[PDB]
Structure formats: structure tokens, C-alpha cells
Symmetry: D2
Subunit: 334 residues, 4 copies
């Protein structure tokens, strides 16, 4: 009575998805794939700088590793098509490598014998893109390859839904103050992608960087396609981020208290609500996809012209991971 999951890419997302899946009955990681030995894998599962020590027991054994009395088969294969997914009976591949972010590229897992693929990032192609608790009812089981969207898109989507539904979204800009990630360099150095900002010492700088999140929000919410854009600022915290959205609305005479009350009313397991004066380190490890922060809501009015600004915290690691694993369980049921 268990969905067989494979994780491809035992990185920040793959390993935390593993932690998360240890709490979900009939979701079972049976295999992992990465570019390293089992020793490295076990070690990175047990010890995690920002996320804390793994909550149980990990042992390096023959096939891969032993976790809480259950065998996880391990692989070191960089080509997905060469994976023994048929032999292992893989129900869902959690695609967390970063190198398969596309319907066609990700098809490789289907070939290998897996039935479904959920990608842990935006992907290109004829795919559904899903934010759990905003978007997931759009799934139905016809789907073969699915995208779980991005960390920022999951912090942003439910905020933007309330704004448009209650106020009419005219247009908006976003800046996310985002923790630095592994694709940024440790020291100033050539960047494999040619990006002169990601090339810079990650933990020593405020770094402007591109994001597709707001420009691509149409994918999870069609009613506001092309109404939002924005960028990121990468700063020196290792995880935990903040999304800031500035919008023009159709409804006039909107107040700070109307905005906060309408977000609080939309709150759920995915969309948290707070009025405490928290900081980034306080959301590290949290499982809400987006935590709306009422202390940061601002309204600028001049005559009949208004600018409305809001902000929501997210552990770009764990908040995204928890949303990804919610979508996985729902996807798997269908």
C-alpha cells in the first residue's frame, strides 16, 4: 500500500523531499540517483547545515543505504534513460537534478520504466505547472510529466490569487530578497552560464539576478498572465527568503487592513499568516509554501491613484519541498 518514488538528484531538494516523505504513508522512496558514492549520499542526508541533523538512522549498505529499517537502492548514473526504473517498478520520479527541466528531456525517465515524473522546477513543454493549494485541482491523471513550479512561484501564487480575486490585478512588479543557492559561486569566478552576477562570491554580496517566476505566473494562474514581472536580489543568508510585490489594482480606496484580512481568510496548510515581527532565520524549516507577513503591507495613495505592496516569507528549501511533496501525494493518487 505504498507509492514507489525515485529521487533523481540527491541535492538540497531531493534530500529534503526524502526527509519529508518519511512522514507520508504509502509514499516510499525506493531508489535514489546522483553523481557520487553512497558514502557522500548517506553523509549529506544525516548532516545538513541549515536544516539540522536527520531525525533517524542511516546506514551505508550494498545496494545503496539503510534508513529506519528500510532499504534505499542507490545509483550513480548521470543518464536518466539508463536507470533501472522498470526493474524497480518506479511509480513517480521526483526530478530534482536541475538538468531535466523539460517535458521532452524528462521523458527519459518514462523510457527507463517510470510511470510519472514530477519536476522540482519550472519546465518547458506541454506540461502542467502546479502550486499545491492554488493550482493542484487542475491535475486529473492524464498527466505523465508535471512541474511543481519554483520556490518563488509557490511564495507568490497564493498572494497574487487573493489580490486579483478581491481587488482586480491591473499590473505588478516583484522583487524577491532570496537566500543564495548552490549555483552561485563561493568565490568570484567564471560562471558556467556566463552570468556576471552569479559569478560573484555568494555569501559576501547583494546580487541582482533574473527570475522567471512573476513573468510565468500565468502558467499557474491564467487570469493574470502577462500582468506581473520582477527580479531577485540574492543576499548572504544560506536559506530563507522574502517575496515583495508591488501592484496597481482596479478596486479604489483599498486599505492595509482590507489587504491583510483577505490574505488571512485565504490561509491554509500552504499559505500561512503571521503578524509577528519575524526574520528570515525564523522560517528555516517551515512547511507553509508562503507565509504572508501583515507587518509589511503598505499602501500609497495620491488622489485616486494607489500602489499596493505586500510581502511573504518562504523557506525556498523546505517551503518548496513541502509543496512539492503535497503535489506528489495528490499526483500519485490519480
Amino acid at each position: 500500500m505504498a507509492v514507489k518514488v525515485a529521487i533523481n538528484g540527491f541535492g538540497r531538494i531531493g534530500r529534503l523531499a526524502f526527509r519529508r516523505i518519511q512522514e507520508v504513508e504509502g509514499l516510499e522512496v525506493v531508489a535514489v540517483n546522483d553523481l557520487t558514492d553512497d558514502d557522500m549520499l548517506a553523509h549529506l542526508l544525516k548532516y545538513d547545515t541549515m536544516q539540522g541533523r536527520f531525525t533517524g538512522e542511516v546506514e551505508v549498505v550494498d545496494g545503496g543505504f539503510r534508513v529506519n529499517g528500510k532499504e534505499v537502492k542507490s545509483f550513480s548514473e548521470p543518464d536518466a534513460s539508463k536507470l533501472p526504473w522498470k526493474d524497480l517498478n518506479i511509480d513517480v520520479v521526483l526530478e530534482c537534478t536541475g538538468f531535466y527541466t523539460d517535458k521532452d528531456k524528462a521523458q527519459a525517465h518514462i523510457e527507463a520504466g517510470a510511470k510519472k515524473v514530477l519536476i522540482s522546477a519550472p519546465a518547458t513543454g506541454d506540461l502542467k505547472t502546479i502550486v499545491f493549494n492554488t493550482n493542484h485541482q487542475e491535475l486529473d491523471g492524464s498527466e505523465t510529466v508535471v512541474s511543481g513550479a519554483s520556490s518563488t512561484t509557490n511564495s507568490l501564487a497564493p498572494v497574487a490569487k487573493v489580490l486579483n480575486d478581491d481587488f482586480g490585478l491591473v499590473e505588478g512588479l516583484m522583487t524577491t530578497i532570496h537566500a543564495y543557492t548552490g549555483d552561485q559561486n563561493t568565490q568570484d569566478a567564471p560562471h558556467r552560464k556566463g552570468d556576471k552576477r552569479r559569478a560573484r562570491a555568494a555569501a559576501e554580496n547583494i546580487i541582482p539576478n533574473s527570475t522567471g517566476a512573476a513573468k510565468a505566473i500565468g502558467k499557474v494562474i491564467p487570469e493574470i498572465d502577462g500582468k506581473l514581472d520582477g527580479g531577485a536580489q540574492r543576499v548572504p543568508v544560506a536559506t530563507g527568503s522574502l517575496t515583495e510585490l508591488t501592484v496597481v489594482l482596479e478596486k479604489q480606496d483599498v486599505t492595509v487592513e482590507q489587504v491583510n484580512e483577505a490574505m488571512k481568510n485565504a490561509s491554509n496548510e500552504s499559505f500561512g499568516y503571521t503578524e509577528d515581527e519575524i526574520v528570515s532565520s525564523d522560517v528555516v524549516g517551515m512547511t507553509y509554501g508562503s507565509l504572508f507577513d501583515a507587518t509589511q503591507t503598505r499602501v500609497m495613495s495620491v488622489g485616486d491613484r494607489q500602489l499596493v505592496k505586500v510581502a511573504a516569507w518562504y523557506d525556498n528549501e523546505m517551503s518548496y519541498t513541502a509543496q512539492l511533496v503535497r503535489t506528489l501525494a495528490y499526483l500519485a493518487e490519480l
Copy 2:
């Protein structure tokens, strides 16, 4: 015949002001006041974590200390009215303690015998708030107490002025992503002003915080009074900051190129312009009050309806200090 300056608070701004004044002909620092002794004062002047070693000879003498063959007397007197300003024929106090940011309170320096005071911060009371090269001309010689505004206000004013003069400023919101400062706690601990966010480990968090830069811009540019608002996020870089501004403009079919060009045309020694993809560490020690970054200009257009975003860097330490010492020499000569 040289202007005689006393620096109250030999802190980050006060010691960098000391460095600047060594470049300005006919300004001399004859005295310094703080809460410590000469061993500490000299040492902090010689070694500076973010701004580099001070170049000349610094020796502790009987007066206080000697810098490059020049005597600076020093005192350790928390009560400014007891300072010997009359005896030393002080022309201007640079008030950099953070404890006299008020016209009435700053009057303690005038009672002690200084002719004028220039405060290194926003200040309450019946006084002028001055951004060099935006409104320093508003000074006419009859001022005894003057505020040199804030780092953020200095980064924001020339940008906001061009937006209004060239496009018609309807309204706008600001975020400044600001390096952490000395009023933040090293570790989570009770905060002296009761701020629950400045209570937190400065170097381990993105911390939201208030700033009056946009709200009180009318003091510097009266014609856009009440048109801007916004706040700050304090992040773990030790100096160097970015101001992001989102606005609606009367001019209707705005392009990135029009905005970038209007800014370049306003550049001078206070207001720089760059087209390079820089990060915060690149502005450390710069002497522009504000460096416009043309790579971060965006125009979001939905039908006839546009939002415009711009960003300008500032070394909140050295950019602010270079501006303060310019306003200082100008005020002295009046």
C-alpha cells in the same frame, strides 16, 4: 583661516569623515569626542574592516593623537554641553554620535561654543535636511543646526528628482536592501530602542525595518512631498546597499532607454551612472552619494498602464560620508 571641525562620535561616519576631510583644502579636524581613550581611537582610525587601512602615521600623544604631523585633541565627554568648543574656536561640529539627532538637543554644541552643527543623520526640529547636489543651495548662512539627511535619502533624491522633472512623478514605493549597521545586535538580545527586528543577529538574517527616506523626501524635494513611501531590509553584508524604486509617471510611453538616458544626463560627482553588472561589494568606498545602475531599469506595460522600476547603489558608509563632508565644506564657506 582653515575651518575648524570637531567630530562628535568617532564612529563609522565620524572616522570616515575624518579621512575625507584630509582631502578637503581649508577644512581641518582639530578635536574629536567619544566615550573611549586615545589607544582605542587611533587604533580604529588605523584599521578598518571594510574600508581598508588608513594610510598615514597615527601616534597617541598627550593631546589625544597626531595624524600625519597634525594634532587632534580628544575628549571622552558624553555630555556635549561640557565640551570645550569655545576654547578651541570650533566653527562646525560634525555630530555623528546618533544621540543628538534633534535641533534642540544639538544646541548643546552651540552653548559649548561651536558656531554650527551638521548632524550625520535625519534630525527632528526646526532645521534643514540637505542632500549635496540636490538641495544644498537652500542653505543661506543663517542656519546654526543642519541635518545631512540619511544614506538612503542621499541614494534616493537624485533619482527621484530626475523621475519627476523628466516624466512627472505620480507616486512610488521604495525598498532599500541595506547593509547591517552598528545599532543592530550581534546576537539576538534585548534591543535598547525596543525594536524586535534590530534585536536579531545582524549577520544571520534578512531583517525588515522602517526608514523615513521616502516618506520624508519632501524635506529635500518639496515638489514630490507625500508621493513616495517605503522601507528597508537589513541583510548580512557589512557595508554597501541598494535602493529599488517603483513608480507611476505622467509621461506615457516610457522606455528603459529614456529613463537610463535621463539619469546619465544628470550625473555629476554626487550622482554616478553605470552600465556594468556590479554587486554590493563593488561600491564599497565609492564617493558618489548614489550610483544609478542602468542594468536594473525595467518598464512593465499592461495596455496604456506602466510601472517603472529603477535601482541605485550606495556605500551607506562612504557615499553618505562623501556627501556629508561636501555639505560640510559648503556650509562652512557660507
Copy 3:
């Protein structure tokens, strides 16, 4: 039913000791004192940059704050001698302010009505300095004022005791690579105790500093009095530290293996043992006083002459606090 505890100084060690007491039956914190209000105290209890969110619920109430249904009384009285310790029937004060670290200073609490005082630091005067599971046995219940030693002494003593007992300590030198603490400055600035290195930006430097842990070890282990000395390097992690000790011994032809086994054989709840290649963030929140790392044992031999190096991790915050609370329970039950 429970020993009634008051915490003087609700700082890092105060708050963590509060959290730790929640989990030790027979101990109850009935009051807290600091220099702040209840809004701030409840906030710092609930939220913690490195140590994570408080598990229970916390609420400001009229005399203080309620934690998990229990009322804690709070006060903000800088002079210990005025605290209503008599009417609260306080059994022990945990003295965690940093301002009463001497026997006669701490006596103020006794005069205010506490039965006993345990100071969260080295302390001067006629008192016992106690590291739990190395020498707490020297307490006989009759003590009025006791020192819980330092984080570094607690990391060091069990290690030094094994080296001496099993190999005969001749002499040795220590360096502790130690997380930065609240008594360092956020930015370069005058330091209160005139210390020119603690003056420096804590999160941006390696900073040599003094410590007495090794030189005063004799207070904890009399038989090696005078044999150890050494220092600290403060570095940019917010908590988590490592004690390295290089010794000369009486035993000859000593091997890495004999040293590791001796250390494992002495392991208990205060002295941990590991062979995992962990790093500082891995010890954040651990409740061992000292965590011996067998991967860092080195022996240098030249002919008949050897130097033996070892290293033991500690969370200078939580390791020390768990040692404190054990000594507290022991002192109270006598």
C-alpha cells in the same frame, strides 16, 4: 513539588536555560529578570536565530508571560539586591547577566531572598567552579554561590582528565576556534572593556582573543593545575566551537588509537564521542558538554619525543547550557 528557579539575565544562556528547564522535571522557572519589557522577552524566547523556534506557546500577560499554561513573573531591575526573591520563595538563581561574576557581587541575590546562586560563567572569589560529570561531585549541598565555569572549560575538562588519567599530563597548549558572541561589536567601534580586537566587526574577521579556560583548568581538575594555557580565535559562525589541545605526556610511543579509545571509554551524556567528519553547524543545539572528534587526533613522533593533538566540538551556547542545568539540578537536590 519543584525547585523554584529564577533567571537573572534572559540572554542567550538565560533563554536557552529556560528552554532546557522545560524538559527537566523537578525544576521550574518562576521568574525572569532583564532590562527590557515583556513584549521583547516573549519574542526572543519564541524566536531564535541559531537555536530555532520555541516548541510551546508563549503569551504576554499582566505580570510577565505565560508559557505552556504556566505564568512566569518578569521584572526589569538592574540591581539584583532589589528583586522580590524572598516573596517568590526562590530556591536558586541562574545568574546569566554577565554582571555578577564574583562571590560577593552575586551575594546580592541571597540578600534579596534566594537560597543559592549559580553563575553562568567563571567567577572570582571563594566558590566552587563546577563542570558537570568532571567535578560536580565536589558540591556538598552547603554552597551558597557556585560557578558553572565557561563553555570552553566544559569542552576541555573531560578531554584533559582522560589525557592525564590515562597517559600522565606533563604540559599542553590550547586554541579554541570559537563562534562570535554578544560581547563583540557588530561593526568596528569602541569596545567597552578597551579590548582592540573585540572592538572589530564580529562576523567579518578571524579575531584572536584571550581566555582562561586552559590556564585556570586547575579550578576544575586540581592535579593538572598550572599545566595548560592557550587562547581563542573568534570566527564568523553564530554558534558552534572547537577546542584543539596539543600536549606532552608521560606515557611514550602513544598512538592515535590509544588516545581515541581512552576518550570513547569515558563517554557519557556530558562527554560525547564521534568518528563522523562533521562541521560546526552539526553541533548547534547538542546537549553534550564536549564532543570528542576522533577524526582530528594526531600524534607527532620524532625519535622518543611526541606531541599529541586532539579536538572536541561544543555548542558554546547549548552545550554549556545543558551542563549548567545538570549542575543546577544536582545543586538543588542536595
Copy 4:
């Protein structure tokens, strides 16, 4: 007649060497090779997070880039034997990739037409390891491939030389508290060489790591072959490092003053001396290979048995680069 230098690997050491060479007449960098494009090489030369802005002007041109009016040719070739060193009359290659750290591999540069190769690290094979002003006089002219030693070795050699000549070195152990480097990971992730410690987030951790600097000291000072060993602790400063050495000496009754005078007596342009209480950010950019800090000197005596401890600072970046360049000029001169 100016020496013609090609730099292989335009990274931290290669870029800094390029900058340092602009300060040294007789030496001309004519070519640069790496794995990126001209836009990125030029940008990373112009901007540098820790070492500050390049003083020169830099322009991308058809062959490469122009620096102050002189053309530097640039190549994008991973196989060094395919490089056009004979066409360009390369006198010395500065091999700074990390990928040719071997006599036989480095020979690819000579095959390709360069007269000599100087490797920016320790190297395998039958070649000499040079720390300038300690053993550079061992270069007799016949050499074609040479090692510039490591940053730690350059910090340690002049210190160990004095201890041995003046006091007779019996044995010693070393710990270097070292800035994180580019081969450590930004976030916890699998590591290229299977190192479970360089795997972990560089800027969030104290990370033990192995160094060959002490153990291989004998290649630089043969008289002390085998008498030193030790390791490293990598910490969250982006550059700037400290070497502590703990030693047994033949000379008895050694004092702090004798050790300090003896080090002051050996100072030169490679080996600096200070009595100021500095921290790591104060050495960033310094051109001494080793800066002895007299404030950190300690002598432990127990009867007739002493341990002596010293510490020397180095900018692992610029201290080593300035040494490498001195060795370059010397090696070129014969």
C-alpha cells in the same frame, strides 16, 4: 627584453597575479587562458569582492582585452599543449588552473612553446618547491618546471626557519585558521574529490581540513624534514588566514621576548613583523608572504619543559600571489 608571461587559469591567483604584475616592471602578461569568454574574464579582472576594484581601464577587443592600452590575447583552451606559446614567445607560464599540479602534466606548456612553467600550488613529480626569501636561491637556472608552494607553506617557512636556526627545532604541530576557497561548496552538496568536509556550506561552518604544508615543509627547508605536521580549519571569511605553530625546542629557558626579537630580526619584504592587535581583514591585500604577530607569542613552562607557540597572518590570496610573482621574476632572471 621584458619577460613574457602567459597566465593559465584566470582565477583568484591568476587574476591577482595579473594585477600584481602591472605593479612590477620587467614583467609583461601577453596571454591569458581559461574556459570562459572575454566578457567574463574582463568583468572579473575589473571587479573583485575582497581585493577591490582594478585601478586600470579594461576593454574587450577582438584578440582578448585591452588593459591600459596594451592588448592581452585570450584563449579558451582546456588542453594546454594546443596553446600558441611559441608564436607568442612565452618566457614563463604561470599555471594557476589547479589542474596541472604535476611535473609531467605541466610539461604540456613547454611542448606548446613556453620556456618555463611556474605552478601556483604544490606539485607532484621531480621538481623544486620554492618559497621566495626562504629557499629561492636553490634555483640554479636548469629548471623548466617549478612549484610556487602553497599559501600556508609561504606563511610557515620563514617562521619555522627562524625557530630552527635560533632554538633548534625538535618537533611541532600546526593549525591554520584559513579563509574559505573556491573548491569548497556554496551549499551542502556532493564534492568533486569525495571530501565530506569540503562538501559543506563554506560560509556557514568551521570545517576541519587536511593540509600538506607542515608535512611537506621539508621540500622548502630540508633540515627540518619530518619535524612538523598539522592541519587546517576553514572558516567564513572570504580571504585572510592565520597559521599557529606549537613547537618543542632544544634551547632551554626560552622567553617570549627572545622569540619575538629573533623574528623581528629576520623581517624583509616576504616576512613582516607586527605588535599591533590586528584581525584577518587587516591583512587582506598585503604583499608580505607571512606577517609574524608578536602579540600571539606564548611560552608554556613546567619545570625544565617548555612548549612555544607562535602565529603568522597571511592573505592566502595576495600574500601568496606576491610571493609567486617574486619567484616568477627571479626564475625569469636566470
